[PDB]
């Protein structure tokens, strides 16, 4: 009856290598997907070049070079008093082009340290094992995930990783927002997900369910393999969890939102329930998807299903059925959906709606029943340096308050299992979307700008005490 | 390839003994809650006696005599082609009181009459075990389902039709509309489905959420009996499905959507997990709610799960978050709910949403993954007979039909499991909210008006042959 969350509840940062790692070519880091692609902002996309282009910046090179201040950015951690940190194993570090027969000492002995660093101080590693960062030799070699031998790639690498910090990692993640693809309009989710490069004329949709298909059989293969290798090891799956409201009672409306949400979350039934929903089969049908699925694909999802789930959550949808010529109501996510018109918005048009956490928490336990782990959170915003040499980020700390009042009205008055809350770019690091410096997140001021600029010095801003507050009286002092 | 539902697809019409048996008081057929409801219309609600009081007139007592006319009524059925025929048992045809050690053989063989009937006509008994018309003694001197001892009432009950029908009824489902008694505001749903007679300054809810919980012990103990008497038994819960929309996409509307769902349906939860939701055990806590909620409880229902989701559809329901005072977002349905703007109504202000059947079809799929079954659904309405002397309804034949085409694409585009779909009130019967004779559902017209008179002649309505089509083309001919 100290507060209203569990004593050991799981507050950290998170952080992904690839954006804030830096020093993407020592040790022999192969060279990865995050590393073609260009800098842009808000509105201009970024550029996936065909390899490394001179005259092109790539912002993930340096980052913030975490790769060599992770000594000092730990200590800053725990000052906040983390009792986890999330981040992810680089593929490229451990199996530079993919393919090799032996792990990079180099890469491994790099993550030993890190790991190492972050228990001295009673901080607890939270490992996601592909967040937007797999070899670029896969991709052209093999063409990235829509072939079948990139699953063993794949495995091969998680059990590696398993193996080595099985006794100092105790949670993990497979595929990071695997459920990123169901856009597949766009460029960027095939692209980090799964290695996808479209060639014109693709059945863009068909090629990215096949993909989907390969890392849920190598989600599950490596959760088998995990378990075997210490049977202690939490491994979930990871979904973005971006909530779809009907925009009204038109019943129209509400089989749109339905029909949304089981594109978008079929990804968390398979790492759950492992069997594909029905709804799928029958539209594969309809659209004439062929999809590689063996018997023995059926067996390994059945058998290597996920012990939690980990989100990332920053957002809601509306969707409505304006859209014309749609009788079966699919979901194409850069057409059916709507601004809600009661909510605020960042400046990169982000939603702002902590209430839809708490609908997605209660969501996740009603239909699945697992343990649940918010491993991203976070608002992106433009600071401002105070006279005083701090940022006064109070709109962050609106932000991620709001959210975290949320939550804990979840577990308080629902009674949803959450293992854990982590704040997402806990330090200013290379965003994903646009790959902006601007687009802060941390509580860790990071003196680079996008034109690659600064001292990289680090500078906690006013929300690193409030939170270091709110993690001390674990909740209760918001 | 005849059609796009499978070809064994259950086709049926559905009443309950006492909407339409009569003969209340042959074979020495216990007094049931039933038998003291008065008659009433839209409006004015119907009067629960203490007792059958003179000049009060129950309908239920003569109904449409069905107890006399059944081999009629049965040739009727097979006429349109039934394959199935869904009914309840009569609790008070088998143990009139309720407390007695044996059963009442007219009761029985009635029924083995009865089944007999269909069987010859190559039609297969749906047959459900409680439909709101419990022995009116349980009441008085037990409290209904307030008390635990009733428990054992209706298990011996269960077992005693269970192995008396083992061979014949394949087809079986414990407590009509379970969660309808989630409105425990009014008396109605609180005394059909528990029997419960409020006394003034009672905690209404309270006293339903115990009740609730005795009856689904009390299911799970049946249906682990009826597997023990013939493993074949399918024996599922039925649940009333009305769907509840938020009224727009304001966070606020999503949140009392979900939240009442969670409590409308927690005992959907219940009969296919096994185990309550934790936010209903976080909600009692809230409320000081107490249960009587033993560890041999929590064994029987982890251990009685249902083969199957039997439930009724006729319409959905709108929320907002309008009411005051309402900051842990509580559900009552007497005062939240609101208009649909978008759709129709009956007369009886029931709204019409084909669409709605759909939703309800993916959302228990989704969330539970058993076989489905509509078990109840259709269109209560005025009739009118045409100088031809046939009801042309073609009202009735238009709900109908957009429900069917619904269901439909459901089977078709969705993949959901269902077993079969039956027509509510398939002959012209007693209404259960009003007692009404003119509030029609059925293909059948019985001469028979809420005065109490008419020749009881049957006559076939337009929807007749419509129905007996559908039935032929298994659904391609609506
Ligand atoms: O603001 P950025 O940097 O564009 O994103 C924030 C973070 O959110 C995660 O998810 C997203 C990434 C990009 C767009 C949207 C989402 C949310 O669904 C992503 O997995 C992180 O790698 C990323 O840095
Ligand atoms: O039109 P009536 O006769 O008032 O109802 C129709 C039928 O629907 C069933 O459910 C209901 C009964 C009453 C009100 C609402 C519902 C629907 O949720 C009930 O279980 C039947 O017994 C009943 O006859």
């Given at each position: 009856?100290?507060?209203?969350?569990?004593?050991?509840?799981?507050?950290?940062?998170?952080?992904?290598?690839?954006?804030?790692?830096?020093?993407?070519?020592?040790?022999?880091?192969?060279?990865?997907?995050?590393?073609?692609?260009?800098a842009?902002?808000?509105?201009?996309?970024?550029?996936?070049?065909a390899?490394?282009?001179?005259?092109?910046?790539?912002?993930?090179?340096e980052?913030?070079?975490?790769?060599?201040?992770?000594?000092?950015?730990?200590?800053?951690?725990?000052?906040?008093?983390?009792?986890?940190?999330?981040?992810?194993?680089?593929?490229?570090?451990?199996?530079?082009?993919?393919?090799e027969?032996?792990?990079?000492?180099?890469?491994?002995?790099?993550?030993?340290?890190?790991?190492?660093?972050?228990?001295?101080?009673?901080?607890?590693?939270?490992?996601?094992?592909?967040?937007?960062?797999?070899?670029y030799?896969?991709?052209?070699?093999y063409?990235?995930?829509?072939?079948?031998?990139?699953?063993?790639?794949?495995?091969?690498?998680?059990?590696?990783?398993?193996?080595?910090?099985?006794?100092?990692?105790?949670?993990?993640?497979?595929?990071?927002?695997?459920?990123?693809?169901?856009?597949?309009?766009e460029?960027?989710?095939?692209?980090?997900?799964?290695?996808?490069?479209y060639?014109?004329?693709?059945?863009?949709?068909?090629?990215?369910?096949?993909?989907?298909?390969?890392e849920?059989?190598?989600?599950?293969?490596?959760?088998?393999?995990?378990?075997?290798?210490?049977?202690?090891?939490?491994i979930?799956?990871?979904?973005?969890?971006?909530?779809?409201?009907?925009?009204?009672?038109?019943?129209?409306?509400?089989?749109?939102?339905?029909?949304?949400?089981?594109?978008?979350?079929?990804?968390?039934?398979?790492?759950?329930?492992?069997?594909?929903?029905?709804?799928?089969?029958?539209y594969?049908?309809?659209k004439?998807?062929?999809?590689?699925?063996?018997?023995?694909?059926?067996?390994?999802?059945?058998?290597?299903?996920?012990?939690?789930?980990?989100?990332?959550?920053?957002?809601?949808?509306?969707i409505?059925?304006?859209?014309?010529?749609?009788?079966?109501?699919?979901?194409?996510?850069?057409?059916?959906?709507?601004?809600?018109?009661?909510?605020?918005?960042?400046?990169?048009?982000?939603?702002?709606?902590?209430?839809?956490?708490?609908?997605?928490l209660?969501?996740?336990?009603?239909?699945?029943?697992?343990?649940?782990?918010?491993?991203?959170?976070?608002?992106?915003?433009?600071?401002?340096?105070?006279?005083?040499?701090?940022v006064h980020?109070?709109?962050?700390?609106?932000?991620?308050?709001?959210?975290?009042?949320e939550?804990?009205?979840?577990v308080?008055?629902?009674?949803?299992?959450?293992?854990?809350?982590?704040?997402?770019?806990?330090?200013d690091?290379?965003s994903?979307?646009?790959?902006?410096?601007?687009?802060?997140?941390?509580?860790?001021?990071?003196?680079?700008?996008?034109?690659?600029?600064?001292?990289?010095?680090?500078?906690?801003?006013?929300?690193?005490?409030?939170?270091?507050?709110?993690?001390?009286?674990?909740?209760?002092?918001?």
């Amino acid at each position: 009856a100290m507060s209203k969350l569990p004593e050991n509840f799981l507050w950290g940062g998170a952080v992904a290598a690839h954006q804030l790692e830096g020093g993407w070519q020592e040790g022999g880091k192969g060279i990865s997907v995050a590393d073609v692609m260009t800098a842009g902002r808000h509105g201009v996309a970024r550029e996936i070049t065909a390899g490394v282009l001179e005259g092109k910046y790539y912002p993930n090179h340096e980052a913030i070079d975490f790769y060599h201040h992770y000594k000092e950015d730990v200590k800053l951690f725990a000052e906040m008093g983390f009792k986890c940190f999330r981040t992810s194993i680089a593929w490229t570090r451990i199996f530079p082009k993919g393919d090799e027969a032996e792990p990079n000492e180099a890469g491994l002995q790099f993550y030993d340290d890190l790991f190492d660093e972050c228990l001295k101080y009673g901080i607890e590693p939270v490992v996601t094992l592909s967040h937007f960062e797999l070899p670029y030799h896969l991709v052209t070699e093999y063409g990235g995930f829509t072939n079948r031998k990139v699953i063993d790639f794949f495995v091969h690498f998680a059990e590696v990783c398993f193996r080595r910090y099985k006794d100092k990692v105790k949670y993990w993640m497979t595929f990071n927002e695997i459920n990123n693809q169901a856009n597949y309009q766009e460029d960027f989710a095939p692209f980090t997900n799964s290695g996808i490069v479209y060639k014109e004329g693709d059945d863009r949709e068909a090629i990215m369910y096949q993909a989907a298909h390969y890392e849920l059989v190598a989600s599950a293969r490596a959760v088998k393999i995990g378990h075997a290798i210490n049977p202690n090891l939490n491994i979930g799956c990871m979904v973005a969890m971006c909530p779809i409201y009907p925009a009204t009672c038109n019943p129209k409306d509400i089989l749109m939102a339905q029909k949304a949400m089981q594109k978008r979350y079929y990804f968390a039934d398979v790492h759950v329930h492992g069997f594909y929903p029905e709804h799928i089969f029958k539209y594969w049908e309809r659209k004439a998807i062929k999809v590689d699925f063996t018997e023995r694909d059926k067996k390994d999802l059945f058998e290597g299903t996920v012990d939690y789930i980990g989100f990332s959550y920053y957002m809601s949808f509306v969707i409505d059925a304006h859209r014309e010529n749609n009788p079966y109501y699919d979901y194409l996510e850069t057409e059916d959906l709507v601004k809600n018109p009661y909510v605020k918005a960042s400046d990169w048009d982000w939603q702002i709606d902590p209430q839809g956490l708490r609908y997605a928490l209660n969501w996740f336990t009603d239909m699945y029943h697992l343990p649940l782990f918010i491993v991203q959170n976070g608002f992106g915003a433009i600071d401002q340096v105070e006279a005083d040499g701090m940022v006064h980020d109070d709109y962050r700390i609106d932000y991620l308050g709001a959210h975290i009042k949320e939550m804990i009205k979840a577990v308080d008055e629902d009674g949803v299992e959450l293992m854990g809350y982590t704040p997402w770019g806990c330090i200013d690091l290379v965003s994903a979307g646009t790959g902006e410096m601007r687009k802060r997140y941390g509580f860790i001021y990071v003196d680079k700008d996008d034109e690659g600029k600064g001292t990289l010095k680090r500078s906690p801003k006013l929300s690193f005490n409030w939170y270091k507050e709110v993690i001390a009286s674990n909740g209760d002092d918001i």
